[PDB]
Ligand binder design. Structure first.
Ligand code: ADP
Lengths: 52, 427
């Protein structure tokens, strides 16, 4: 009977959250396009030579 | 380039029309219309080639154009069709039987042509990079229309290095087998001469497409097939004529497999002609074997020259026409060559002297036709070359009558030689 728990930060705003995720859509599309283009322009599946 | 003009080098083919109508003096041959028309009929049946084992016998006087008609048929038949010329005395071998030699002669004029569609790559190498660590590299092939790159494999690099192909080189690559063949050096093949170089033969780069599909054809005779299949020594066709293929599966298997090939469309047939000159040399055994060898479906057509008449058959004491037994004479179609008249002998002499590049006068032609009608046409023909040499020696332009007369007095024919043989002459 000395200690006790705590909790805070009860905030979630419906419309502001919708806006926030509609914005995160930008980051998601940027990540997808960046990954796709980087893969296509760097991998170009192939091999290299040996190091003897 | 330099292949001299033999006795039969003047005829380039039978002087026939589209309807097999012999012309008087066209295409080297002169006169002999009936025998030339028969030769043309048999030649048309040959070029058709749906009947096997047919025999013809060109009989006639000595020196009337029998071998001439044979060479004319050969020329009119041209390549891409086997024509084997053999003297009757050539089959008497010491290492192979007469029947085996005749089977060889027959099967040597039967062609088998395999047509293949192997694709290749033709272009001018621009660069051949290769790194040894298995070594790996690349190649840049250029044609006048496009350029491309190829990643070279292990055996590809091996073959390229063995052939020692370099840049600027025009090469062909059989993609199926990887066989390389360099056709020449392109203008780029210039090695920037600064060292011990002694080759500057350039050629235009290959045109068209890079990876084209052309058609190859491999034509070999049944004789070569059975020879190379006889034993592991697959070079007897050039190594030496040591032969004796047993008539066991070897030849029967060649025949059966060629039949299956013809059926499946791999290589069907191209029949041929066998010109047996002086067939009277063949033996009774040879004739008896031919009797049934002409009955085989793989039997090419044969034409046999004949000078003899009613004379004994070799190897026996049977008197038979042409020196051939009636047994074989029955299968043959006989064509008789007639002797040349005055205007035919004169025209033959004219064509011969114009072929051997010798200008004769109008009286030279007359005296030569006289000599050739009194004596053999062959002697008259041989007189032309001898008469041209005296003219060249005296620095003349065209052979006159005095040169021909000097040559006639200088050289002797058989009749005058016999009439001069008045002494014992070591009989
Ligand atoms: N119709 C012809 N036209 C041109 N030359 C001929 C003709 N007939 C024969 N000859 C010539 O006569 C020469 C000898 O005759 P050849 O043809 O050998 O007859 P054979 O074979 O009967 O001896 C040959 O060199 C040939 O050129």
């Amino acid at each position: 009977r000395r200690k006790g728990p705590h909790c805070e930060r009860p905030l979630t705003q419906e419309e502001l959250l919708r806006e926030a995720k509609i914005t995160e859509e930008l980051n998601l599309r940027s990540l997808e396009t960046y990954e796709r283009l980087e893969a296509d322009k760097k991998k170009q599946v192939h091999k290299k030579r040996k190091c003897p | 380039r330099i292949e001299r003009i033999g006795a039969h080098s003047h005829i380039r083919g039978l002087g026939l029309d589209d309807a097999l109508e012999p012309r008087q003096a066209s295409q080297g041959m002169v006169g002999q219309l009936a025998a030339r028309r028969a030769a043309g009929v048999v030649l048309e049946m040959i070029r058709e080639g749906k009947i096997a084992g047919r025999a013809v016998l060109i009989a006639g006087q000595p020196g009337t154009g029998k071998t001439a008609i044979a060479m004319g048929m050969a020329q009119a038949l041209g390549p891409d069709t086997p024509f084997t010329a053999i003297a009757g005395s050539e089959i008497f071998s010491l290492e192979m039987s007469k029947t085996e030699a005749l089977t060889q002669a027959f099967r040597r004029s039967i062609g088998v042509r395999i047509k293949e569609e192997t694709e290749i790559i033709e272009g001018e190498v621009v660069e051949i990079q290769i790194d040894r660590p298995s070594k790996v590299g690349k190649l840049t092939l250029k044609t006048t229309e496009m350029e491309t790159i190829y990643d070279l494999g292990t055996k590809m690099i091996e073959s390229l290095t063995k052939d020692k192909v370099q840049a600027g080189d025009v090469i062909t690559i059989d993609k199926a087998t990887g066989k390389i063949s360099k056709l020449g050096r392109s203008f780029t093949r210039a090695r920037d001469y600064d060292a011990m170089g002694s080759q500057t033969k350039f050629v235009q780069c290959p045109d068209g497409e890079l990876q084209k599909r052309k058609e190859v054809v491999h034509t070999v005779s049944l004789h070569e097939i059975d020879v190379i299949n006889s034993r592991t020594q697959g070079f007897l066709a050039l190594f030496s004529g040591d032969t004796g293929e047993i008539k066991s599966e070897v030849r029967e298997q060649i025949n059966a497999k060629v039949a299956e090939w013809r059926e499946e469309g791999k290589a069907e047939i191209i029949p041929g002609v066998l010109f047996i000159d002086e067939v009277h040399m063949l033996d009774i055994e040879s004739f008896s074997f031919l009797n049934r060898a002409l009955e085989s479906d793989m039997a090419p057509v044969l034409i046999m020259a004949t000078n003899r008449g009613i004379t004994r058959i070799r190897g026996t004491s049977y008197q038979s026409p042409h020196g051939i037994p009636i047994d074989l004479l029955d299968r043959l179609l006989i064509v008789s060559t007639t002797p040349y008249s005055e205007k035919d002998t004169k025209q033959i002499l004219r064509i011969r002297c114009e072929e051997e590049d010798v200008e004769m006068s109008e009286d030279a032609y007359t005296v030569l036709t006289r000599i050739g009608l009194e004596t053999s046409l062959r002697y008259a023909i041989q007189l032309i070359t001898a008469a041209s040499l005296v003219c060249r020696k005296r620095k003349g332009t065209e052979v006159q009558v005095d040169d021909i007369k000097r040559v006639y007095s200088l050289f002797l024919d058989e009749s005058r030689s016999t009439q001069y043989m008045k002494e014992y002459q070591d009989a």
